[PDB]
Ligand binder design. Structure first.
Ligand SMILES: CCC[C@@H](C)[C@H]1CC[C@H]2[C@@H]3[C@H](O)C[C@@H]4C[C@H](O)CC[C@]4(C)[C@H]3C[C@H](O)[C@]12C
Ligand SMILES: CCC[C@@H](C)[C@H]1CC[C@H]2[C@@H]3[C@H](O)C[C@@H]4C[C@H](O)CC[C@]4(C)[C@H]3C[C@H](O)[C@]12C
Ligand SMILES: CCC[C@@H](C)[C@H]1CC[C@H]2[C@@H]3[C@H](O)C[C@@H]4C[C@H](O)CC[C@]4(C)[C@H]3C[C@H](O)[C@]12C
Ligand SMILES: CCC[C@@H](C)[C@H]1CC[C@H]2[C@@H]3[C@H](O)C[C@@H]4C[C@H](O)CC[C@]4(C)[C@H]3C[C@H](O)[C@]12C
Ligand SMILES: [Mg+2]
Ligand SMILES: [Zn+2]
Lengths: 1337, 251, 151, 153, 33
């Protein structure tokens, strides 16, 4: 069966490979994160609960009073989303938390409490997320993009000898907490271990061990093994240890023989020694001369330390120890190659001998220039780590920390302990000695995703700790009674962090609203920049590159090209975030032999230790792999594996690409550069007047369109009971009506609203009266959607041939009938505001009487001085008339004479009115006025308020009466049984439905409850109506000093013209060069012209031959459509129509799709055929597209040639072009780079203040920057005069430029160059120092 | 300087001068009270620090910051750097009588001429049109000429065509790598809003027609016009200056 | 990588081959950006060092110069004498290879005709005036430079 | 400075431990100095106190009522004509640094977008010169005595 | 802190003799001392 919205127009689907997992909800990261942020979590670990638990309760010094946290809630927002957008205010909810203050008494620190005071305190407003994933911050719609940051834990890296010519590699271990300090270890070229807290001055590592109260003997015990001796002078031999020996003495066991001197000990010698059970040997005294004593060995006779631990053991020391009775000694076992000595050398360099000295050195390191205090140093050390208030190793941090050190406890403390540091040091030593491997910093198993619901929590916690410190300081003094827990808290400290994060942050940016695709792809975007993340100045390479771990998680293609390329990525289609924030992707599990149907979401690190078969792998009808060997990707590489040793399989062929790159048909045939460009450009298409579905698509259009949120999707099934250009009323089915509901839903459509890019956001219904619907069906397709499918461009008939140099480099030649039919005409809505302020000389006024206006420009203004709604204005017309008082303005002599002669008075008021910008021409569609609370509300404002109140009352009344109709219908339905009245029921009036007599049964109770519900509706309606009248008729909170504002909205309609930029989906962009008459375009033998002519020379170099395949397949699809259209015009019975459509819907080699028309009623078949008369839509999945043979077969089904090339004639002369050319249908886009937004010219204008140069930008009417390279170019020529006039007269020669202007308007082209202003400013600035720079004559 | 509303904008030098003057006046006051030498020594150290910050901030110690928590710009900072008077404003600056727009093909042109939109040509040559209108008697004063060009009457376009007759314009593309990135052409007035560029010159500019833009400047003086005609014309530069080979080859 | 992409674009690439292609393309874009960054710095330094050189004389009268001969990297010749000598000024008489008489007297700008004459007589060494051996103070002379190359 | 003033005005008859007769002078001096040399556009002392009182009342009102205090409510709670409140709220705050990076595209500063509003347009200068020429032409078309009188007046 | 910054500035001098041959400078630390 097919969906009702989908059986109107079924898209023929190639794509042999079957589908097992449905595409998920695209923008789910945002919604899940923010839902977690604001949510009552019983075991507080998410969102606001976690922050409150972490901070509160706050204890004052000596514990006299305690401030406790109880609960929190969010009040309902005062303004809804639309009113926030109109009013230019944030959409947010106020946070109210129940605090409780308890005061203690002497002798009862925790016993009886003097008093407890509960109160709700309001601390800030938190912005709320809209149901699509956006925030309304100041009327504008923002998006907060996720962040990819290196996760906390412990990471072992090296420098692979880059900095050393010796080629040695210096390993280093770093510990990164979620918040705290970076305890960093490292090696030294001399194999001296070092530690650098917070990347400060380096210190020997062992210091910290002493700072943890460790003695030298304990250190050597931890990090080293030991050997022993007995006395004469017998040694207990361990065969394994002597892996390399014989340098001094081979062996002496049992006397006779075990091995000879000189020859190096081999494995056979060890085998013989272990077989013989060698446990005692004799060695020469000199052999021990090179060993190092392990522990302390004092002269027991005299109680004198002969040799401290870790000291070279010499023969004289041997004699002294023997005299002391030390018949046994411990020496640190260390073989140079494997068990190298590294801590011992650090001890040799150790400038400390006890805890106090180490603490003093640490104290000096952390805070220099301070006196080392015995009490302060220990406190600083114990506070740096080991404290819950200054150091947090998060749950993900702890998980990765334990996993890296190969432990079994996933959970643990967030604060470092001695065991952790010892284990990290031992791990680093193991890595250096040759066991283990270093970590990879680009592995997506080491990088984590932060999302808005976590960054907001972090900022809120920052504010909360600030307020906690403030309240602690406040409690430190006084601690009097009658101090409620509400005078110590001010909202502003907490609200500042939140509103700064949401308002001015790196990761919080205006949404892209070109089309649904741009919004969808902006919401699911990942950024490596932002706070806590690297910067473009020093980021790559080797982090901008694509890693093998991105497969299935981050898109390889879609990335911006420019300064930040590879630092901003796009989430793949099926990618999902782990519980800890790591991207994961789904794989269909494979049992012994069968490819089961249950998916497991595997992560980067977890994925390495399996072998995953490819998605494009043939499977039998039972589920077995057909091929004996299957190509699958192992740990890092891909190769052939036996059919019986695969344990996972890819879930789809589009699993690797993002949504933007999965909308390109024939992506396999496009070069990677061109695919990247094509995705980036496809994000920029401008919606046109009428939407046009792609004739060749990939099947991802409907998902993007529905999940984008631009459509109106039914929430429950029913029957369309009312349709209109502005609303849809659906009558729900009985099966989903709920007990006490009327069962009617109302969808109100968005009509001609402005987007962030100054485009049009218009929804229009695509249903009709009496049409059934089911939940999930689209009811009103928004901008750039067609019956529920994304439709960014138009299907143009294109030919690939040169044609006279009008498509020379990348230019496009467009027909004049593409402009007659308004196919690329777009509507742009722009806002203009006219703010009147109270100036020093008096207030400004908005009036229709303006000084020195000839009454020609005042026609469109109404009596109040504001343009009429619906008026058509052009550049220079006045929209709002304003006047500003001015000063005396002494009149020059001659002007005084002119006034005397003609007796004219002074205006006394300026003309600072709002007028349409030059070059624009549109119609006024909306005017809205904002006025301060204490003003008069000129007639126009009162009229606008009257109409707004009428609209509000009408909306509420229509709601109430439609719901009354539904309720009374349901009551009448219920009145069919249990005391049924049929003929007499309708006699009495409807108001008496509530007072109907019925048997003493539950049905009468139900009717009474419904009547009470209707009364509740009445009461709610009246209350809401009064509140809405109050809300409409009130003042406004404008800036300080502004009396009122008037905003005018112009709807401009832009037609395509030479200079506009067009593009396809394959990275083939161009600029229109000519609009050619219809009778000049090339035509075929049936007389049909060609819409667009493209240059074939563009295809070979840019190896994107997916456009040629798209053109062939579009030709085939339009041929099928033309055949259907011909059969439909000739009035042929439904039998042949059905037979042909069925024949066309089953082509190809074992395609997955199967549509059977025998189950379609004649009405359904005719509607389908009428929707297919412009071409049969075709779906070509990303890496599972249509084969060329299938394209040839589909061309052959129509009567077209299978070559894809026809014979064309020249319109100008009628002679046929030789060597036939390729014509077809290609999907063309109109990118948002319009020539009328880019043409800029300047003769003279306004100049900057401090430096008298022309202003910059098109908005300011600025000039062109003439840089240093252009100066070099003019010096390469001998153009000294051009250079001089560009340096002085044209830029900042204040009195030379007016002379030049006067000379030009006097017919004399000569300049007096003078000296620029910048040099004078430079002289004054150099002189403002002590220097004396002058201009000698 | 006052901004719109009750707000102001000020340079960082006002803060530094205020600090210097405050500390100097405080020291002068302090030397009359006969304070302990500790206080006067501290005051003199502070005065030295403030004068140091004024002359050059962030060179001896820590840079003094403002309310925005950014380091204040000093006198030295206003001279050095890529954003100083020596580089940002003295060797390259914004210019009058200039425009920019997107470029199209125009394959019908001759090697020495380009296509200039009528609107851009009207805006760039306004003083010339005023002079011509006054000279020919169509307008009485310069205000009448202004109103005539603002209404875009019929005579205005004939006057514009007369002004443009033999008046080169310099076309330039942003990455000016060699001297052939600026060339002088003769305008031909066209409809639309895109500049038509002769195909054979594209290689000199390294320009393609997939969205590129060009800037147009108009020489003013007689000397500048003659230099554009005799030195920078496009029919004078047909050989590369790096070698002798032509740079006007069909592409 | 040992195993190559065995498919063209007429045929399609599968997912792994396309992944490798992406590896290549990203690096290509980054390298382009870096090259554009470096080539501007080099030009800026080159202009700074040699900005004030100007032709400020017609002939310094010097009799010295460089000895131009074709460049040979072991085997074949990759730059004939015509490329290296066209448009320069001879510093000494170009005696015929037979040592008979002067073929090109002196101070004669070698245009195409003179180069053809030299090629016909098969001379492989000339003495051409050069900028690095100019006697002019504060600038260069027109004879020690050569010809414009653009006019 | 305040301590040096106290030490000169301190007597041991009262018995106040210096740390009680001195803190007052220190606080007074510091507060007055902050009120005299802390902002570029100097605000008198009494107006600084008024602003601080208004801020404290606004904080109390915000915490109590929950949403915000309006100028009418501020005037009611603060006993002012409701025009003084607006005037005090209209104080110019603190000037924006003219180097605040605002371009975000080429390290542009806020000071690059402020225009010189006192410059005379080049067309107005030409108009003035043309008017002078026209007056000179016309005034030569009447008897010399009339021209002299008109130029004299 | 300032001494570290001063030493770093001196080191960058070479990228010579004076720097090779070459308290806290904070006005507040000296006042405290
Ligand atoms: C079940 C596991 C889940 C409850 C654990 C596993 C990882 C933990 C989060 C991460 O550490 C990242 C953040 C750390 C900061 O403290 C702010 C909270 C933060 C979201 C943590 C809350 C919670 O503890 C998480 C989600
Ligand atoms: C039997 C089908 C019922 C349905 C067709 C009837 C019952 C109630 C009617 C609507 C309501 O009255 C409210 C509005 C009244 C306006 O005047 C016209 C529009 C408006 C939506 C009406 C259109 C339509 O007529 C409705 C939906
Ligand atoms: C990163 C760039 C910051 C810059 C864009 C932001 C930061 C602070 C903003 C200004 C201040 O609010 C003060 C004024 C307030 C007026 O109401 C509107 C103008 C005004 C100058 C503001 C415009 C702009 O919004 C500013 C400059
Ligand atoms: C994205 C960059 C924004 C920039 C183009 C916009 C945003 C805020 C604008 C400035 C502020 O409003 C403050 C002043 C207001 C005056 O009225 C005109 C000058 C003034 C500097 C404005 C010029 C410019 O328009 C600014 C810098
Ligand atoms: Mg280009
Ligand atoms: Zn010379």
């Amino acid at each position: 069966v097919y969906s009702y919205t989908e059986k109107k127009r079924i898209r023929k689907d190639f794509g042999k490979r079957p589908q097992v997992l449905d595409v998920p909800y695209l923008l789910s990261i945002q919604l899940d994160s923010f839902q977690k942020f604001i949510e009552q979590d019983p075991e507080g670990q998410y969102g606001l609960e976690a922050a409150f638990r972490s901070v509160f309760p706050i204890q004052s010094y000596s514990g006299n009073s305690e401030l406790q946290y109880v609960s929190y809630r969010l009040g309902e927002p005062v303004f809804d989303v639309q009113e926030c957008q109109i009013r230019g205010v944030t959409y947010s909810a106020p946070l109210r938390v129940k605090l409780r203050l308890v005061i203690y008494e002497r002798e009862a620190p925790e016993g009886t409490v003097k008093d407890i005071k509960e109160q709700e305190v309001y601390m800030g407003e938190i912005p709320l997320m809209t149901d699509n994933g956006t925030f309304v911050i100041n009327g504008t719609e923002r998006v907060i993009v996720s962040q990819l940051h290196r996760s906390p834990g412990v990471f072992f890296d090296s420098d692979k000898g880059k900095t050393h010519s010796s080629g040695k590699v210096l390993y280093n271990a770093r510990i990164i907490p979620y918040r705290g300090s970076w305890l960093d270890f490292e090696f030294d070229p001399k194999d001296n271990l070092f530690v650098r807290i917070d990347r400060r001055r380096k210190l020997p590592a062992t210091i910290i061990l002493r700072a943890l109260n460790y003695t030298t003997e304990q250190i050597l015990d931890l990090f080293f093994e030991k050997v022993i001796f007995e006395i004469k002078l017998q040694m207990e031999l361990v065969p394994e240890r002597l892996r390399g020996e014989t340098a001094s003495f081979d062996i002496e066991a049992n006397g006779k023989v075990y091995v000879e001197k000189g020859r190096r000990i081999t494995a056979r010698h060890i085998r013989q020694l272990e077989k013989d059970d060698v446990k005692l040997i004799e060695v020469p005294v000199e052999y021990i001369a090179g060993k190092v004593v392990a522990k302390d060995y004092i002269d027991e006779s005299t109680g004198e330390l002969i040799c401290a631990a870790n000291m070279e053991l010499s023969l004289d020391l041997l004699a002294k120890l023997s005299q002391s009775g030390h018949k046994r000694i411990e020496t640190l076992f260390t073989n140079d190659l494997d068990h190298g000595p590294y801590i011992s050398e650090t001890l040799r360099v150790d400038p400390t001998n006890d805890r106090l000295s180490a603490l003093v050195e640490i104290y000096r390191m952390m805070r220099p220039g301070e006196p080392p205090t015995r009490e302060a140093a220990e406190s600083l050390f114990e506070n740096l780590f080991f404290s819950e208030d200054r150091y947090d190793l998060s749950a993900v941090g702890r998980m990765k920390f334990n996993r890296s050190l190969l432990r079994e406890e996933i959970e643990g403390s967030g604060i470092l302990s001695k065991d952790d540091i010892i284990d990290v040091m031992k791990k680093l030593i193991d890595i250096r000695n040759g066991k283990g491997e270093v970590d990879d910093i680009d592995h997506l198993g080491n990088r984590r995703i932060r999302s808005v619901g976590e960054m907001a929590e972090n900022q809120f916690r920052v504010g909360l700790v600030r307020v906690e410190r403030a309240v602690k300081e406040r409690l430190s003094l006084g601690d009097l009674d009658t101090l409620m827990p509400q005078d110590m808290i001010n909202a502003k400290p907490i609200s500042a962090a939140v509103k700064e994060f949401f308002g001015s942050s790196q990761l919080s940016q205006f949404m892209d609203q070109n089309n649904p695709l741009s919004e969808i792809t902006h919401k699911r975007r990942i950024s490596a920049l932002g706070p806590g993340g690297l910067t473009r100045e020093r980021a790559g390479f080797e982090v901008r590159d694509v890693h093998p771990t991105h497969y299935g998680r981050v898109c390889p293609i879609e990335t911006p090209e420019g300064p930040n390329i590879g630092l901003i990525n796009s989430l793949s289609v099926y990618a999902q975030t782990n519980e800890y924030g790591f991207l994961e992707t789904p794989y269909r599990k494979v049992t012994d032999g069968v490819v089961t149907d249950e998916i497991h979401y595997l992560s980067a690190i977890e994925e390495g230790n399996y072998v995953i078969a490819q998605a494009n792998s043939n499977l039998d009808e039972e589920g077995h792999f057909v091929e004996d060997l299957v190509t699958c990707r192992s740990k890092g590489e891909s190769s052939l594996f036996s059919r019986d040793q695969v344990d996972y399989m890819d879930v789809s062929t589009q699993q690797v690409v993002s949504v933007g790159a999965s909308l390109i048909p024939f992506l396999e045939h496009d070069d990677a550069n061109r695919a990247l460009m094509g995705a980036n450009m496809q994000r920029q298409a401008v919606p046109t007047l009428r939407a046009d579905k792609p004739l060749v698509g990939t099947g991802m259009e409907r998902a993007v369109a529905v999940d984008s949120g631009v459509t109106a999707v039914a929430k429950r099934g029913g029957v369309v009971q009312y349709v209109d250009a502005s609303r849809i009323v659906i009558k729900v089915n009985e099966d989903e009506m709920y007990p006490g509901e009327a069962g009617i839903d109302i969808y109100n459509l968005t009509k001609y609203t402005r987007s962030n890019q100054n485009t049009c956001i218009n929804q229009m219904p695509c249903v009709s009266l009496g049409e059934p619907v089911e939940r999930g069906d689209v009811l009103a397709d928004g901008p750039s959607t067609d019956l529920g499918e994304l439709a960014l461009g138009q299907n143009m008939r294109v030919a690939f041939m040169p044609w006279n140099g009008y498509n020379f480099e990348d230019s496009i030649l467009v027909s004049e009938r593409v402009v007659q039919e308004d196919r690329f005409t777009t509507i742009h809505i722009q806002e203009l505001a006219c703010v009147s302020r109270d100036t020093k000389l008096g207030p400004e006024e908005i009036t229709a009487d303006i000084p020195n206006v000839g009454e020609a420009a005042l026609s469109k203004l109404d009596e109040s001085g504001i343009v009429y709604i619906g008026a058509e204005v052009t550049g220079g017309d006045i929209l709002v008339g304003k006047v500003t008082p001015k000063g005396e303005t002494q009149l020059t002599p001659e002007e005084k004479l002119l006034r005397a002669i003609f007796g004219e008075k002074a205006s006394d008021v300026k003309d600072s009115s709002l007028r349409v910008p030059n070059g624009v021409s549109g119609t006024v569609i909306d005017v809205q006025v904002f006025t301060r609370d204490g003003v008069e509300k000129d007639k126009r404002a009162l009229e606008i308020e009257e109409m707004q109140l009428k609209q509000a009352k009408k909306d509420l009344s229509e709601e109430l009466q439609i719901l009354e109709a539904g309720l009374f219908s349901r009551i009448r339905a219920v009145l069919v049984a249990g005391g049924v009245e049929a003929e007499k029921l309708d006699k009495l009036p409807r108001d008496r439905w509530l007072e109907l007599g019925l048997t003493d049964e539950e049905k009468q109770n139900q009717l009474e409850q419904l009547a009470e519900q209707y009364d509740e509706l009445k009461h709610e309606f009246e209350k809401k109506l009064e509140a809405k009248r109050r809300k409409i008729t009130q003042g406004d909170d404008l800036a300080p000093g502004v009396l009122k504002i008037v905003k005018v909205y112009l709807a401009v309609k832009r037609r395509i013209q030479p200079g506009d930029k067009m593009a396809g989906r394959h990275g083939n962009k161009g600029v229109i060069s000519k609009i050619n008459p219809i009778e000049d375009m090339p035509y075929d033998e049936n007389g049909t012209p060609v819409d667009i002519v493209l240059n074939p020379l563009g295809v070979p170099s840019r190896m994107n031959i997916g456009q040629i395949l798209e053109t062939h397949l579009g030709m085939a699809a339009k041929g099928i459509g033309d055949k259907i259209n011909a059969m439909l015009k000739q009035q042929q019975e439904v039998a042949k129509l059905r037979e042909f459509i069925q024949r066309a819907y089953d082509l190809g080699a074992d395609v997955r799709q199967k549509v059977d028309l025998s189950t379609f009623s004649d009405e359904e078949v005719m509607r389908l055929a009428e929707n297919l008369r412009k071409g049969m839509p075709i779906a070509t999945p990303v890496f599972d597209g249509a084969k060329e043979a299938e394209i040839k077969e589909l061309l052959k089904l129509g009567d077209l040639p299978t070559s894809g090339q026809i014979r064309l004639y020249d319109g100008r002369t009628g002679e046929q072009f030789e060597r036939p050319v390729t014509v077809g249908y290609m999907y063309m886009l109109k990118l948002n780079h319009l020539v009328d937004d880019k043409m800029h010219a300047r003769s003279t204008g306004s100049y900057s203040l401090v430096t008298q140069q022309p202003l910059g930008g098109k908005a300011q009417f600025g000039g062109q920057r003439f840089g240093e390279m252009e100066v070099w170019a003019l010096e390469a020529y001998g153009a000294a005069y051009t250079l001089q006039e560009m340096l002085t007269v044209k830029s900042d020669d204040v009195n030379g430029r007016t002379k030049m202007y006067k000379n030009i308007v006097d017919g004399n082209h000569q300049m007096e160059p003078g000296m620029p202003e910048s040099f004078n400013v430079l002289l004054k600035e150099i002189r403002s120092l002590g220097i004396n720079i002058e201009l000698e004559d | 300087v006052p901004l719109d509303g009750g707000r102001f904008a000020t340079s960082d030098l006002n803060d530094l001068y205020r600090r210097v003057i405050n500390r100097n006046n405080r020291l002068k006051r302090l030397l009359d009270l006969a304070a302990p030498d500790i206080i006067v020594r501290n005051e003199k150290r502070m005065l030295q620090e403030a004068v140091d910050a004024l002359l050059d901030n962030g060179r001896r110690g820590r840079a003094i910051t403002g309310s925005n928590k950014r380091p204040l710009k000093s006198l030295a900072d206003m001279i050095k750097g890529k954003q100083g008077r020596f580089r940002q404003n003295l060797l390259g600056k914004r210019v009058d009588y200039s425009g920019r727009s997107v470029i199209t093909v125009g394959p019908y042109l001759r090697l020495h001429q380009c296509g200039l939109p009528k609107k851009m040509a009207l805006e760039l040559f306004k003083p010339f049109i005023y002079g011509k209108l006054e000279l020919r008697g169509l307008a009485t004063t310069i205000k009448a000429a202004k109103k005539m060009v603002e209404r875009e009457e019929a005579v205005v376009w004939d006057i514009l065509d007369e002004v443009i007759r033999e008046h080169p314009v310099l076309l330039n593309r942003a990455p000016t790598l060699h001297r052939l990135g600026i060339q002088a052409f003769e305008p031909v007035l066209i409809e639309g809003k895109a500049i038509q560029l002769h195909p054979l010159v594209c290689a000199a500019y390294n320009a393609d027609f997939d969205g590129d833009q060009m800037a147009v400047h108009v020489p003013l003086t007689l000397e500048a016009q003659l230099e554009a005609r005799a030195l920078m014309m496009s029919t004078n530069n047909i050989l590369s200056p790096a070698n002798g080979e032509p740079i006007i080859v069909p592409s | 990588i040992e195993t190559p992409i065995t498919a063209n674009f007429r045929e399609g690439l599968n997912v792994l081959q396309y992944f490798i292609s992406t590896h290549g393309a990203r690096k290509g874009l980054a390298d382009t950006a870096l090259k554009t960054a470096n080539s501007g710095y080099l030009t800026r330094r080159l202009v700074d060092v040699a900005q004030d050189l100007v032709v400020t004389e017609d002939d310094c009268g010097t009799h010295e110069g460089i000895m131009m001969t074709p460049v040979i990297e072991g085997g074949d010749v990759k730059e004939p004498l015509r490329d290296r000598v066209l448009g320069r000024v001879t510093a000494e008489d170009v005696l015929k290879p037979g040592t008979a008489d002067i073929l090109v007297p002196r101070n004669t700008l070698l245009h195409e005709q003179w180069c053809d004459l030299l090629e016909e007589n098969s001379v492989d060494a000339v003495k051409v005036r050069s900028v690095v051996s100019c006697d002019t103070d504060f600038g260069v002379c027109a004879h020690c430079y050569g010809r414009d190359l653009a006019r | 400075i305040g301590l040096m003033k106290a030490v000169d005005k301190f007597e041991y008859r009262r018995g106040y431990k210096f740390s009680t007769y001195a803190t007052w002078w220190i606080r007074q001096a510091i507060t007055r100095s902050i009120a005299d040399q802390a902002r570029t556009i100097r605000i008198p002392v009494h107006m600084i106190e008024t602003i601080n009182k208004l801020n404290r009342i606004s904080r109390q009102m915000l915490q109590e009522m929950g949403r915000e205090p309006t100028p009418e409510e501020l005037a009611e709670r603060m006993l002012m004509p409701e025009d003084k409140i607006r005037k005090v709220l209209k104080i110019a705050k603190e000037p924006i640094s003219m180097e605040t990076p605002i371009g975000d595209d080429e390290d542009s500063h806020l000071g690059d977008f402020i225009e010189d509003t006192t410059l005379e347009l080049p067309l107005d200068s030409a108009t003035t010169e043309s008017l002078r020429a026209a007056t000179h032409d016309v005034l030569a078309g009447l008897t010399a005595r009339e021209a002299k009188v008109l130029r004299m007046r | 802190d300032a001494d570290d910054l001063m030493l770093a500035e001196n080191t960058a001098d070479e990228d010579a003799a004076e720097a090779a041959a070459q308290r806290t400078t904070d006005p507040v630390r000296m006042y405290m001392r």
